[PDB]
A paper describes a structure:
Autophagy receptors target cargo to autophagy by binding ATG8 on autophagosomal membranes. In this study we discovered that the ubiquitin-binding autophagy receptor NDP52 binds preferentially to LC3C, in contrast to other autophagy adaptors including p62 and NBR1 that nonselectively interact with several human ATG8 orthologs. NDP52 comprises an N-terminal SKICH domain of unknown structure (aa 1–127), a central coiled-coil forming region (aa 140–420) and a C-terminal ubiquitin-binding Zn finger domain (ZnF, aa 421–446). We determined the crystal structure of the NDP52 N terminus (aa 21–141) containing the SKICH domain and CLIR in isolation and in complex with LC3C.
Since the SKICH domain fold was unknown, experimental phasing was performed exploiting the anomalous scattering of cadmium ions contained in one of two independent crystal forms. Single anomalous dispersion (SAD) phasing of a 2.7 Å data set was used to build an initial model, which served in molecular replacement to determine the 1.35 Å crystal structure of the NDP52 SKICH domain in a different space group. The structure revealed a β sandwich fold comprising seven antiparallel β strands, organized in two sheets of four and three strands. The SKICH domain resembles an Ig-fold lacking the eighth β strand, which places the N and C termini onto opposite sides of the β sandwich. The specificity of NDP52 for LC3C is mediated by a noncanonical LIR comprising the tripeptide Leu-Val-Val, which we refer to as the CLIR motif. This binding site in NDP52, located between the SKICH domain and a coiled-coil forming region, is distinct from a previously predicted LIR within the SKICH domain, i.e., Trp-Ile-Gly-Ile55-58 (Kraft et al., 2010). While this sequence is reminiscent of a LIR motif, our structure reveals it to be buried in a β sandwich-fold and inaccessible for canonical ATG8 interactions.
Numbering used by the authors:
A (entry chain A), B (entry chain A): 19 to 80, 87 to 132
């Protein structure tokens, strides 16, 4: 079904070694739950158990939301990744555009 | 460490269906932050993610502080609860005496 969690301001590349802020908003009828989470997943991931790293959904919740991924936990390779919001039932409720962890280049 | 947020005038029981005013004061060197909050937690809570309900810390801040919990959001059972002040880093900076939501009784 349609995404119930929308990622905003997602970059196409993030600087290696920097912390990354992930911005998201809940759609009108969506009810977030305390064990929901956001993963960073390699594009083409098969199951939610494959996340590279994750953060639990930011609490408390009443509006812009954000969660911070610390540099230590971010990918070091050149593969493509996305954010995915996974609810307590294991259902993906939102997914972002793909990005890499790399410096800016001329093709950008 | 020692509490940096002190709850005052906390009752041992609050009337079911009434709004509850939570009174607190900041200790001298404490610096409140805009995403700090006060939760109502069941006694014996393990993580700050377990709050029953919450309010963001009252703003603006310059002294007595207070925040109002609306009746709709309060517990309906007979369990024991407390207020806890949680800062932006997830650290508990103050905690109140325990209370229930119930009428006065003879044991009181």
């Amino acid at each position: 079904g349609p995404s119930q969690v929308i990622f905003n301001s997602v970059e196409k590349f993030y600087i290696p070694g920097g912390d990354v802020t992930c911005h998201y908003t809940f759609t009108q009828h969506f009810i977030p739950r305390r064990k929901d989470w956001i993963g960073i997943f390699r594009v083409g991931w098969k199951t939610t158990r494959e996340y590279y790293t994750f953060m639990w959904v930011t609490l408390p919740i009443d509006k812009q939301q954000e969660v911070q991924f610390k540099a230590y936990y971010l990918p070091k390779d050149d593969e493509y990744y996305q954010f995915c919001y996974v609810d307590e039932d294991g259902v993906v409720r939102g997914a972002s555009i793909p990005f890499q962890f790399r410096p800016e280049n001329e093709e950008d």
